Design an enzyme around this catalytic site. Structure first.
Site, short mmCIF file in Angstrom:
data_model
loop_
_atom_site.label_atom_id
_atom_site.label_comp_id
_atom_site.label_asym_id
_atom_site.label_seq_id
_atom_site.Cartn_x
_atom_site.Cartn_y
_atom_site.Cartn_z
N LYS A 292 0.83 -1.20 0.00
CA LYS A 292 0.00 0.00 0.00
C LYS A 292 0.86 1.25 0.00
O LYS A 292 0.51 2.26 -0.62
CB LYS A 292 -0.93 -0.01 1.21
CG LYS A 292 -1.89 -1.20 1.25
CD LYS A 292 -2.72 -1.24 2.52
CE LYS A 292 -3.36 -2.62 2.67
NZ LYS A 292 -4.47 -2.76 1.69
N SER B 279 -3.97 12.48 29.74
CA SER B 279 -3.20 13.41 28.93
C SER B 279 -2.74 14.61 29.75
O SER B 279 -1.71 15.19 29.43
CB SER B 279 -4.00 13.88 27.71
OG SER B 279 -5.11 14.65 28.10
N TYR B 280 -3.47 14.97 30.80
CA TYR B 280 -3.03 16.07 31.66
C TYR B 280 -1.66 15.79 32.26
O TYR B 280 -0.73 16.60 32.15
CB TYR B 280 -4.07 16.30 32.78
CG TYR B 280 -3.77 17.49 33.66
CD1 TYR B 280 -4.14 18.79 33.28
CD2 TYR B 280 -3.13 17.34 34.87
CE1 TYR B 280 -3.86 19.88 34.08
CE2 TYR B 280 -2.82 18.45 35.67
CZ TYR B 280 -3.21 19.71 35.27
OH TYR B 280 -2.92 20.80 36.07
N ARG B 281 -1.50 14.63 32.90
CA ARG B 281 -0.23 14.32 33.51
C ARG B 281 0.85 14.12 32.47
O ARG B 281 2.02 14.37 32.75
CB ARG B 281 -0.35 13.07 34.38
CG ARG B 281 0.86 12.71 35.16
CD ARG B 281 0.52 11.86 36.41
NE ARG B 281 1.71 11.62 37.22
CZ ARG B 281 2.44 10.51 37.23
NH1 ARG B 281 2.10 9.45 36.49
NH2 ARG B 281 3.52 10.45 37.99
N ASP C 35 -13.62 11.39 35.00
CA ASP C 35 -13.49 10.05 35.57
C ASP C 35 -12.79 10.18 36.91
O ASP C 35 -11.84 10.97 37.03
CB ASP C 35 -12.66 9.12 34.70
CG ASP C 35 -13.34 8.76 33.38
OD1 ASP C 35 -14.50 9.18 33.16
OD2 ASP C 35 -12.70 8.03 32.57
N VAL D 25 -10.99 14.57 31.88
CA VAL D 25 -10.17 14.67 33.08
C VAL D 25 -10.25 13.36 33.83
O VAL D 25 -11.35 12.84 34.07
CB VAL D 25 -10.58 15.84 34.00
CG1 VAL D 25 -9.59 16.00 35.11
CG2 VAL D 25 -10.68 17.16 33.20
MG LIG Z 1 -8.37 10.81 29.62
NA NA Z 2 -11.26 9.34 31.10
#
Ligand SMILES: [Mg+2]
Ligand code: NA
Ligand code: NA
Ligand code: NA
Ligand code: NA
Length: 320
Positions: free
Chosen positions: A62, A167-169, A235, A178
């Site tokens: 490809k 992704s914050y940390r 979460d 979050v």
């Molecule tokens: Mg997350």
């Molecule tokens: Na989450």
DNA sequence: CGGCAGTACTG
DNA sequence: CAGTACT
DNA sequence: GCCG
């Protein structure tokens, strides 16, 4: 990315296989795409294509079609259902099987879903927040959300530790959601806090809807006060202190980083989860656990890397 | 041939 | 259980 | 889809 001209086309196929339920084929594409993004120079030869881990005969073929013709004919035969299946599976709580069922039943738009589909409690919340849940938030807003949970938690017990993961940390400028991890160094007083914490977060309207309310995990929806605010996914996981390092590692991710690390552990006769790193794990030929093994002491994230024979990686270099 | 990570929650 | 979700 |  040396190979955008290739990966942009492959990503279309990857997503098509994913929303149609062909999860292992989609996985192979996702891995090839990451490998291609990691390569230094443009891929210029079939021989160089197979050179790369994650690129086989089919994927090299490809790549050669794209470089020679600037196109991949496979893209022209993607089913017309795929954009609708994507539309539907972007409802939180609806995946490939629900999307395909709605499509078979004749639904083609979110208006059709709203007016005619039987929605779970979760899916009705997902639909109500359809746009907001596809948006990211600035890192600063994730900070405000983390701080809101922490202040509510510390009002009950000043000793509770609360940390935004995901992704914050990992240091990202924007966050899809979050991810807050909570524990207590005393090893006991994390227990039974959810009722009071969540009711506290409800009382002036920060927590707007609940998706999952487990003994350990909460998944839901929040909104900061004032104008110009959007609903955001939140979460919360509450863990005993003995599991803190493995829970922190899990919840910081990335997902592909976790999967790679867990696969490595399995090769070494070990098992890695958000609960523990275990060794002498007895499995079968199918790669499935038949014997538990021994939990290894992991007071810190660095201990997990060390016991796997790996150099430590800060959260920012786990963003795979 | 067959795994591809390991787990929680829902109904 | 199958489905969906989390990293 | 890839790889052992
Ligand atoms: Mg997350
Ligand atoms: Na989450
Ligand atoms: Na290869
Ligand atoms: Na979904
Ligand atoms: Na109808």
């Amino acid at each position: 990315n040396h190979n955008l001209h290739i990966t942009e086309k492959l990503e279309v196929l990857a997503k098509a296989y994913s929303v149609q339920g062909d999860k292992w084929r989609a996985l192979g594409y996702a891995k090839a795409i990451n490998a291609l993004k990691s390569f230094h120079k443009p891929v210029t030869s079939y021989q160089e294509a197979c050179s790369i881990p994650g690129i086989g005969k089919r994927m090299a073929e490809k790549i050669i079609e794209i470089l020679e013709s600037g196109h991949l004919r496979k893209l022209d035969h993607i089913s017309e259902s795929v954009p609708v299946l994507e539309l539907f599976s972007n409802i939180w709580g609806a995946g490939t099987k629900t999307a395909q069922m709605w499509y078979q039943q004749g639904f083609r738009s979110l208006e059709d879903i709203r007016s005619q589909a039987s929605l779970t409690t979760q899916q009705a919340i997902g639909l109500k927040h359809y746009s907001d849940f596809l948006e990211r938030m600035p890192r600063e807003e994730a900070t405000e959300i983390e701080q809101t949970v922490q202040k509510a938690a510390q009002a009950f017990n000043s000793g509770l530790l609360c940390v935004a993961c995901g992704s914050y940390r990992r240091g990202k400028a924007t966050c899809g959601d979050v991810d807050v991890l909570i524990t207590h160094p005393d090893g006991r007083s994390h227990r039974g806090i959810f009722s009071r914490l969540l009711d506290s977060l409800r009382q002036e309207g920060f927590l707007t809807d609940d998706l999952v309310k487990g003994e350990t995990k909460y998944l839901g929806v929040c909104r900061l006060p004032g104008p110009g605010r959007r609903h955001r996914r939140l979460d919360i996981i509450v863990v005993p202190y003995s599991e803190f390092a493995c829970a922190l590692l899990y919840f910081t991710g990335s997902a592909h980083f976790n999967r790679s690390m867990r696969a490595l552990a399995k090769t070494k006769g070990m098992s890695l989860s958000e609960h523990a790193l275990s060794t002498a794990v007895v499995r079968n030929t199918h790669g499935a656990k038949v014997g538990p093994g021994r939990v290894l002491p992991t007071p810190t994230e660095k201990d997990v890397f060390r016991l796997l024979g790996l150099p430590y990686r800060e959260p920012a270099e786990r963003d795979w």
